[PDB]
Design a binder for these strands. Structure first.
Ligand code: Q9W
Ligand code: K
Ligand code: K
Length: 545
DNA sequence: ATGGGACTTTTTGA
DNA sequence: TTCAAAAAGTCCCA
């Protein structure tokens, strides 16, 4: 329900929006939290505002109504005109109202607190400053009735597999006053994800992004599996449009290293660099000058992409794995004819250059003709989960029989030489599958088009793709998920560019030697490491780095 | 108990 | 008809 933002980050965000406010010029700033919860941000906003007013009370008294501007009147003023909060949870709003009332401890004061869905409220004026931490809800945990509303009314930032907080970015930008400043902490995934493309376009074309703080896979929220970033944007009449990017360099740090977050950002734990907002394409490549030179060099040298030369596909989606996946030593497999059985691997079975021997079998139930010839398999293996299987979407509509795989794909795509890689990994792991391995969606596969077989071999491809050069090169634009995990999905893996030059033969031969060592029983992996270093040297020579 | 490490399903819009 | 994206991941241990 309610998530607690660490106090240091709250202080940083509030100071980011208010440290340079000219209260004498405008003693009526509107500061809004659109998902205020119990007031994590708004109470700190109250404290900052109270200091700001009390420090200039006499200047305000002289410049304006001298009877209105007294210290004893600051509290009331702040609540009447400055602090605004919205949240869909009425208990949180009640608690926050009590807190703001008890900031003073007569005639009653009207607190601008709204218990509503902030994405449906008719907002009747814009705001000078917007801060907070919106709700994050993905496409699976959002109700379909609400998602229809989002797809209709928030189509500019919300399509397909987008997230709820995209819409909060939209709403915050839309209700921000000209010259206003907004600062929020959200998931970092929209910076790189395919779903966030339109949201990135919206932000880039409607506000000036002041600062991005990328915590990468650091754990900012205790016991929460999410990776966070802090965005600061404004609607000021500026002529430069340069973004300050602070990228964490050590994900293992605890956030309470210093009293303030500014000390952490200025320290050696973070790196700083500037990105020209006008040079952002539909993809935001937020890297330092050395990494940008590296990336551009590789992009310029390589004339092909994997998408050009390869056919990609996601793995089997059974819809209920426990009903179709059995250990190869399970006695129940004696009931299943071997024509129905396929080898089954998980993402952990994928190493560099080769796949572990499979230990699981998939019952490719689509080839079961009818329920009377193979009644025993259905009665004793698959039918154990009939109730769950019948609740799949395609079974409810009758497209799929209750014992069939939900997305069984095409068998001929898997029963061939191909390259496989895990969907989430700490490093590049592209393996040649020789054993017709099937897998779930945690492993992706591709094979080379016939017309590119004489230009690229599987051995050469796994050679360059597993190199240190390509590990770094892919990670430059990859989607950082959690600590030591990057997404390896076709929507970015197929964008990897490859080359073909005079080092092709030696690179291919080194890859073949590595594969031969890795498949031998009396394995000595050290020479594999030495061969990999030599191949990395060849690749760096080829790409001019 | 918590914080850190190993590992990854099927629901879902298009 | 049937593709592929999506971590307020999930689950475990010392
Ligand atoms: O980050 C968590 C905080 O954010 C608040 N909050 C969440 N969602 C909000 C929202 N609209 C979205 C509605 C989506 C559908 C829905 C969500 C939750 C329950 C029932 C239905 N509008 C304002 N505050 C919101 C929530 O109370 C916490 O205080
Ligand atoms: K006066
Ligand atoms: K994390």
């Amino acid at each position: 329900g309610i998530y607690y933002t660490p106090k240091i980050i709250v202080d940083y965000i509030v100071k980011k929006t208010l440290k340079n406010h000219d209260i004498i010029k405008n003693p009526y700033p509107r500061i809004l939290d659109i998902s205020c919860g119990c007031g994590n941000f708004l109470l700190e906003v109250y404290d900052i505002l109270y200091d700001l007013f009390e420090e200039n009370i006499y200047e305000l008294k002289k410049k304006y109504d001298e009877n209105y501007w007294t210290v004893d009147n600051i509290h009331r003023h702040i609540l009447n005109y400055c602090i605004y909060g919205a949240d869909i949870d009425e208990k949180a709003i009640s608690i926050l109202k009590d807190s703001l009332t008890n900031k003073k401890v007569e005639s009653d004061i009207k607190i601008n607190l709204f218990c509503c869905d902030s994405l449906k409220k008719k907002w009747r004026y814009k705001f000078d400053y917007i801060v907070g931490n919106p709700p994050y809800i993905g496409h699976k945990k959002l109700e379909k009735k609400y998602k229809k509303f989002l797809l209709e009314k928030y189509s500019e930032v919300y399509k397909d597999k987008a997230d709820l907080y995209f819409c909060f970015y939209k709403k915050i930008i839309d209700i921000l006053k000209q010259g206003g400043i907004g600062s929020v902490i959200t998931p970092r995934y929209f910076l790189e994800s395919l779903s966030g493309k339109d949201l990135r376009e919206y932000i880039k074309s409607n506000v000036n992004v002041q600062e991005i703080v990328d915590f990468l896979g650091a754990n900012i929220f205790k016991n929460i599996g999410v990776s966070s970033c802090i965005l600061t944007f404004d609607k000021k009449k500026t002529k430069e449009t340069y973004i300050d990017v602070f990228k964490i360099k050590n994900e293992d740090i605890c956030i309470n290293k210093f009293e303030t977050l500014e000390e952490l950002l200025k320290s050696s734990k973070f790196e700083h660099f500037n990105i020209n907002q006008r040079l952002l394409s539909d993809e935001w490549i937020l890297v330092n000058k050395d990494d940008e030179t590296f990336y551009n060099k590789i992009q310029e040298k390589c004339k092909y992409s994997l998408e050009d030369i390869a056919i990609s596909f996601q793995g089997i989606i059974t819809g209920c794995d426990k009903a179709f996946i059995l250990s190869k030593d399970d006695v129940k497999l004696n009931l299943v004819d071997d024509k129905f059985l396929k080898c089954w691997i998980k993402s952990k079975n994928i190493n560099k250059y080769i796949v572990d021997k499979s230990e699981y079998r998939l019952i490719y139930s689509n080839d079961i003709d009818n329920e009377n010839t193979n009644k025993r398999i259905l009665d004793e293996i698959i039918g154990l989960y009939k109730t769950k299987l019948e609740n799949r979407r395609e079974c409810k509509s009758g497209i799929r029989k209750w014992y069939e795989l939900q997305w069984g794909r095409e068998k001929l795509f898997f029963e061939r030489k191909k390259i496989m890689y895990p969907y989430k990994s700490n490093e590049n792991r592209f393996a040649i599958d020789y054993d017709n391995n099937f897998s779930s969606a945690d492993v992706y596969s591709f094979f080379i088009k016939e017309e590119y077989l004489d230009k690229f071999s599987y051995e050469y491809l796994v050679g360059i793709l597993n190199s240190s050069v390509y590990d770094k090169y892919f990670k430059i634009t990859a989607k950082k998920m959690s600590k030591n995990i990057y997404d390896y999905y076709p929507n970015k893996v197929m964008k990897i560019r490859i080359f073909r030059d005079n080092n092709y033969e030696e690179i291919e031969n080194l890859s073949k030697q590595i594969i031969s060592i890795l498949l031998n029983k009396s394995i000595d992996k050290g020479k594999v490491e030495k061969l990999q270093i030599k191949m990395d040297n060849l690749i760096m020579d080829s790409l001019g780095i």
